[PDB]
Amino acid sequence: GNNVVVLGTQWGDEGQGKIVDLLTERAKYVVRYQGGHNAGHTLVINGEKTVLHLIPSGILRENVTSIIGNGVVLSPAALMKEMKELEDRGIPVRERLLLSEACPLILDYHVALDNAREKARGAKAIGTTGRGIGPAYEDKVARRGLRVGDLFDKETFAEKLKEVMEYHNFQLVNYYKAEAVDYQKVLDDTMAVADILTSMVVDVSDLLDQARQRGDFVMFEGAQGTLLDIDHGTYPYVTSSNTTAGGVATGSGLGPRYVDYVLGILKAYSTRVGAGPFPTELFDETGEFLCKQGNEFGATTGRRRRTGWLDTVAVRRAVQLNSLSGFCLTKLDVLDGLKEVKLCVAYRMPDGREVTTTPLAADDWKGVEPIYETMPGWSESTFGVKDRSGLPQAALNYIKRIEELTGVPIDIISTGPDRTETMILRDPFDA
């Protein structure tokens, strides 16, 4: 298909970055449609590592035009920091990147609010990335937030920012009893970059309608994972945007009937960073092995990632929510050297009923237990293998099993962080 969607089928960090950088080789565009700089996607080319937060993952291919879509909450400061960092490395960011005037802006006060709210929650802290994600989304939805388009008239912007900050500062000092964020300070910082931001504005929806008509290859880059979806995730332990496939159209302007293939990135075992239900979570040596071998530390907060076994019950909710066309099984190599590997095929509800469907809000997961299928592991190193032939039968079985349980074909398998340690069994762009 022409329009391919790449998203995390779990709770983020499944390996979308690597997969976007890899498939973009034939793409004209790459579009981020939700989230902000809470994401942290690692590209590794010939050993050279790049971690992107807000900048789309096609940024290293000069043949691709990177687009930050309207669904994205955009921090000017964040953008500037990543730009300078990539430019210093020879990546002419300003020539490859475009953005939406409809993108809300994340300013220092959103960070102050996120921290305050997080503090206020005490024991029940969501465990957010400390960027002002949610607050920026609140402002958007309240219709008081500033957007990239507002920079098109600095005087009027200055007026708008004053009103908003006075509003939020009132709450910050009187209610949370936190320090106020300085108006002038934010105003100045933002104006210093305005012209750069503004210089990259394109009408994204019209642009994508044109690409679509030309049959151009487009890639949509997800952020976070399905179970972190504001609507369908383990609420309130979630991110504030829709991480599921419908977010592709809300956050880019492309008509929903133009999605041709939805590629769901699937890790091979599970990880979650932040508070929240996690049925297959492991607190034993194997959990520790998982973290270790898979270097599971948040590419944005550096926080350690909780690890567990692949949960086919949760993954099946992702299948239906996102109309998966296929999966990209990632981090298989990490399972190398395990006597056995298991996957969750059902959930035992606290009331005794066996179920193969997941609960919705976090509280409804309270006493659910995972029911497993334990399969043989494999001692052979599968790292960097680019051919199924090079995978042991235990590895292939685990693979067939997952397809069986989900009803979705594993079209791509990743065996290491490098762009090329992968086997593409079927290229989404050809399907």
Ligand X SMILES: O=P(O)(O)OC[C@H]1O[C@@H](n2cnc3c(OP(=O)(O)O)ncnc32)[C@H](O)[C@@H]1O
Instruction: Name which of ligand X, a second copy, Mg ion, none residue 127 binds, using a CB cut-off of 5 to 8 Å depending on partner kind.
Output: ligand X
Q: How far is CA 261 from CA 128, 257, 258, 386, in A?
A: 31, 11, 9, 23
From 23-31, 188-196, 299-307, 347-355, give the range in contact with ligand HDA by CB under 6 A: 299-307
Residue in 51, 126, 191, 431 binding a second copy, rule: CB under 8 A = 126
Instruction: Name which of ligand GDP, a second copy, Mg ion, none residue 203 binds, using a CB cut-off of 5 to 8 Å depending on partner kind.
Output: a second copy
Looking at the Cβ atoms of 51 and 396, the one nearer to ligand HDA is 51
Q: Which long-range contacts (CB under 8 A, 24 or more apart) does 230-235 make?
A: 232/317, 232/321, 232/360, 234/276, 234/277, 234/360, 234/361, 234/362, 234/365, 235/360, 235/361, 235/362
From 55-63, 248-256, 331-339, 396-404, give the range in contact with a second copy by CB under 8 A: 248-256
Residue 41 is a catalytic residue = yes
Looking at the Cβ atoms of 130 and 376, the one nearer to ligand HDA is 130
From 7-15, 18-26, 257-265, 394-402, give the range in contact with ligand X by CB under 6 A: 7-15
Instruction: Name which of ligand X, a second copy, Mg ion, none residue 26 binds, using a CB cut-off of 5 to 8 Å depending on partner kind.
Output: none
Closest CA to 79 of 121, 37, 43: 37
Q: What is the DSSP letter of 130?
A: S
Q: How far apart are CA 288 and CA 298, in angstroms?
A: 15
Q: Is 139 helix (H, G, I), strand (E, B) or coil?
A: helix
x-marked contacts with a second copy along 165-204 as a string, rule CB under 8 A: -----xx--xx---------------------------x-
Residue 13 is a catalytic residue = yes
Give the Cα-Cα-Cα angle 359, 360, 366 (nearest 5 degrees): 55
Instruction: Name which of ligand HDA, a second copy, ligand GDP, none residue 129 binds, using a CB cut-off of 5 to 8 Å depending on partner kind.
Output: ligand HDA
The answer to whether 274 contacts ligand X (rule: CB under 6 A) is yes
Minimum Å distance from CB 414 to ligand X? 15
The answer to whether 300 contacts ligand HDA (rule: CB under 6 A) is yes
Looking at the Cβ atoms of 234 and 300, the one nearer to ligand HDA is 300
Helix, strand, coil content of the chain in percent (nearest 5): 35, 20, 40
Looking at the Cβ atoms of 40 and 132, the one nearer to Mg ion is 40
Looking at the Cβ atoms of 148 and 328, the one nearer to a second copy is 148
In sequence order, the β-bridge partners of residue 1 are none
Q: How far apart are CA 353 and CA 52, in angstroms?
A: 43
Minimum Å distance from CB 321 to a second copy? 6
Residues 6+ apart with CB under 8 A from 258: 2, 3, 212
Looking at the Cβ atoms of 35 and 326, the one nearer to ligand X is 35
Looking at the Cβ atoms of 5 and 211, the one nearer to ligand X is 5
Q: What is the DSSP letter of 125?
A: -
DSSP labels for 320-371? HHHT-SEEEE--GGGGTT-SEEEEEEEEE-TTS-EESS--SSGGGGTT-EEE
The answer to whether 283 contacts a second copy (rule: CB under 8 A) is no
Neighbours of 208 (CB within 10 A): 25
Q: Is 186 helix (H, G, I), strand (E, B) or coil?
A: helix
Could you say which residues in the range 76-135 bind ligand GDP, by CB under 6 A? none
The answer to whether 321 contacts a second copy (rule: CB under 8 A) is yes
Looking at the Cβ atoms of 116 and 338, the one nearer to ligand X is 116
Residue in 1, 2, 5, 18 binding ligand GDP, rule: CB under 6 A = 18
Residue in 37, 41, 147, 267 binding a second copy, rule: CB under 8 A = 147
CB 358, CB 314: distance < 8 Å: yes
The answer to whether 75 contacts ligand HDA (rule: CB under 6 A) is no
Strand order in the sheet with 29-32: 97-99, 65-68, 29-32, 218-225, 3-8, 261-266, 326-329, 410-414, 422-424
Helical packing angle, 76-87 and 183-199, nearest 10°: 50
- The catalytic position among 41, 53, 110, 168 is 41
The answer to whether 184 contacts ligand GDP (rule: CB under 6 A) is no
Closest CA to 279 of 7, 8, 40, 11: 11
Q: Is 68 helix (H, G, I), strand (E, B) or coil?
A: strand
Q: How far apart are CA 6 and CA 291, in angstroms?
A: 24
Residue in 134, 274, 326, 416 binding a second copy, rule: CB under 8 A = 134
Residues that bind Mg ion (CB under 5 A): 13, 40, 299
The catalytic residue positions are 13, 41
Residues that bind ligand HDA (CB under 6 A): 12-13, 39-40, 129, 273, 298-301, 303
Residues that bind ligand X (CB under 6 A): 8, 12-13, 38-41, 126-129, 131, 133-134, 223-224, 228, 239-240, 273-274, 299
